[model samples]
Target: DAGKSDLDAAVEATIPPLMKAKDIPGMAVAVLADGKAHYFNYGVASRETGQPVTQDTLFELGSISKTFTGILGGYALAQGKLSLADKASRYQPELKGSVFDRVSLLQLATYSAGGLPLQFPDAVAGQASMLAYYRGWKPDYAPGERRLYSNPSIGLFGHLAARSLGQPFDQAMERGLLPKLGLSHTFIHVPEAEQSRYAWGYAGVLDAEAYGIKSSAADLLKYLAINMSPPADPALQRALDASHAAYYRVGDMRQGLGWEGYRYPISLERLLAGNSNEIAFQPQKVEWLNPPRLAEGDVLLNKTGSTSGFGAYVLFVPARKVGIVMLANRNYPNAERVRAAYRILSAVDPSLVRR
Candidate 1:
């Protein structure tokens, strides 16, 4: 922790301007470097109470929750509980006769289930209606024909994974995945005992199944650290490896189970461009790599997420043994999160940006 103090000071100096520029009310940042963890906090958890953000402050993870869902699905795959090639209807029989029978679980996990909309149609209302919606849903193209990011796609993938494990989605995640990952402060629903640590987003708390995970900067660091250096536990190692396996290419971006990756020495501009709304929210014809492989050298894995009132980002470069997690209370711009993390990551490992 010698030069680390100076590095922390440099990182802290970079946040205030970004917070002001983006109107972020509060943020908790956690970094893993050379096997040590460093944390930084800023602003207030609640504008009303002026509670300063802390390492333990819980912030909504938004779509970052998808990463957890992906890992759980991968765990099921490792246990032989489910196969990526299996039809989703195998576990959710209600989808038996529909287009879902033609869609593979792996395709759904990678958001390559041809042209599934970003969400269920507005008419999709309670749990029963959700199943009804799937039964009648139609695909715009054959499975693996293109990439269209959709919560409903991964949502159903996670649902079936839990079913294969003989449990409900939340219970499977909370009681199985979270514990197995050694996460203590991450939650789908913050228990009554841990509620006090939960920070209120500008729009209050979200309970959406696919995007509602809440976690602390500290807990997120632990999760990222695992991805950077997977544990010796056999089941976990298999699951982590599966989650990182590349399945498709969306332009310059590579799609893993739930993570997006780019080869390093990649420009920050190229990364932000790849994740731009024009690419993420628009449907595109993309090719599925037979056995997807990283370009060469280091690979950077990342994911960004947001809700009405919160924003979050997670990134890791396994070869460098470095990772960062940024969680902000107020809804902040995803590009800004990328820029901020890039600045700090470049400082930590100059080779990250040095071509």
Candidate 2:
């Protein structure tokens, strides 16, 4: 009655077409239903070595890491350690500049901190030096004035959550959260012992080296399941729901906490060109911050991530209890990869699709 065989066949049929058409080097996908997860892998982790993609392949999470930050923020809020209305300066006194001193942590998580820019200024040298950058920075717009997706803003949110929990970001995330939830594969930084199992994240191009992100497709799928229906804490689920609530609606898509909202029949032509300076843009779909509610009533929650070479997507329908988490080496949009996975899910259980 589970139709596991049919689901496997459907996925097998769909993977080849995506690999051929999209030029994805390797992709690892996982699907969840009724608290069970099914994992699949296709393509190669490296084009030169012809290394096969596996469920254990670790691809750079890119901004998907923000979800972890958001979750941490929620957990902190639940513990009475912080409040959304609290100003950023509360956690890091160095953020005492007039512009950012007034900005609230909630505003930052919601991407409403107003013109923080998309990233750190050139002065910040290393990844770990991000705190220095935030300390010296100045905000260009007032909080809640506009939407500008910036890692500095989000990263600071993570940093604040750690401070509230009385631990460093990486340590608290690894020791306190991951272990408590039994998420062995997820990490801010992968350890040396697990290096052998790491998948190299690759850009879609022919001659590129893959980067390492410490995660596995199976673990990622489990994370999604927990997010969809968080246990042991109803507040976690509420926080996730609040994060998904639209904060900024630009066009066909809406912006949520660490996630993206999309509307159907997107103008692909306009979208690809508008954000060309950024990553690959799918011009066809209208981006909305708060997705329009549908009569048929399935909601789509999605986000895409990529580093110099690695690409990944997490898409799910919470109502149907079906979701996908995929990681790939090649650094391309990989929306086609998401669509390909959706096709397989739909074939297995049509209810997974949103209308």
Candidate 3:
């Protein structure tokens, strides 16, 4: 109970003031260290209903779901079910002559698939329309030319990954990857069984592979733990490790398939810049790490997710063997989330943060 008291004090020191300042109704925080996990809860899951936030509350993950998508791609790669070098059309053969013929899976996974917009075109409605949109779409630049943080590009990447693995994207995640990571409470779609646990202000969208995931902080911490260190299962460990490979660089952040990272003990300002609007909204030219580097340690890898009413941020240091998960029912600024995590992580491990 000693560590519990320390975690409670750390979270209490940082979380309450922020929630009051932001007028957030509910939020959850979980800190993982050396495989052990702790939880901190504040506020309510719903303002109108007055439901309290708990460890079971399923906050919408928004684009944090993309990290799950990225892991699925890595899982497929680990099983020899697909190759990043292969054209995306290799799996989605309907677009034999489209620009995707030249768009490798790697480009799609990295948001460098020829400058894909953050969302699909407005004309896209269903299966046929989606295919037509992709087939007719043209690239803004060559593959790997820039990082656009796109949903369509990565969505297709996940779709094709599942196709290669012989299942639907949801099945691949719900029945495949989630189980492997022991994320029992994470889901692409919250079933009736879990509807009560699902929180509001949260948001969805095929976009399922891009930004449709729901998770409780407790289960999400399991995911963070798996990423922080390989579990006992070699195959699952390899899948998680593949997703962490550093493939490109934009500014000071090392770009992984589904995550972004900086050197451990990073400045909050630099971390803010890495997750700034310019990086997410505007196309920034990327410098590909030659031969693609694999992170061994001294790196803080992360991703941010948001929805209409919810915001989420995740950070982990593989070498330090620590991870943090923060989920809120109310949407807030990424800069604020980064700063909050900064103080909270410093609480857990003071050396992990630098101003």
- Using lDDT, give the best candidate's number: 3
Residue 160 CA error for candidate 2 (Å)?
A: 1.4
Instruction: Tell how far residue 71 is off in model 3, in angstroms.
Output: 0.7
TM-score of 1: 0.95
lDDT of 3 by residue, 1-355 (tens): 6545656777887789888888888999988875687788888888878888998899999889988998889889988999888998899879788998999999999899888899877888888998898999999898888889889888889999999999998888999888878788998889999988788893323878988999999988888888876779877777777788788889889888788888878887889999898899999898888777775558898999998889999998887678899999988889888988887777666575434
Order of candidate numbers by lDDT, starting with the best:
3, 1, 2
What candidate 3 gets wrong by more than 4 Å, as runs, is 1-9, 202-205, 353-355
lDDT of 1 by residue, 1-355 (tens): 5448655865776788888877788989999998888989998888888888998999999999988888888899899999999988998878889888889999888877888788777777767888888888878888888788898888889889989999988899999899988999999888999777788787411134469899999999999999878888888887887787777777778788788888876788888987788778987777677775644578889999898899999999998888889999877777888888888887788676576
User: Which scores greater on lDDT, model 2 or model 3?
Assistant: 3
Residue-wise C-alpha lDDT for candidate 2, range 191-270, written one tens digit per residue: 78876666665541100111122578988888777766677766666556656665555554555666664443223343
Clash count of each predicted structure: 0, 27, 1
TM-score of each: 0.95, 0.79, 0.95
Q: How much RMSD separates candidate 3 from the native structure?
A: 1.9
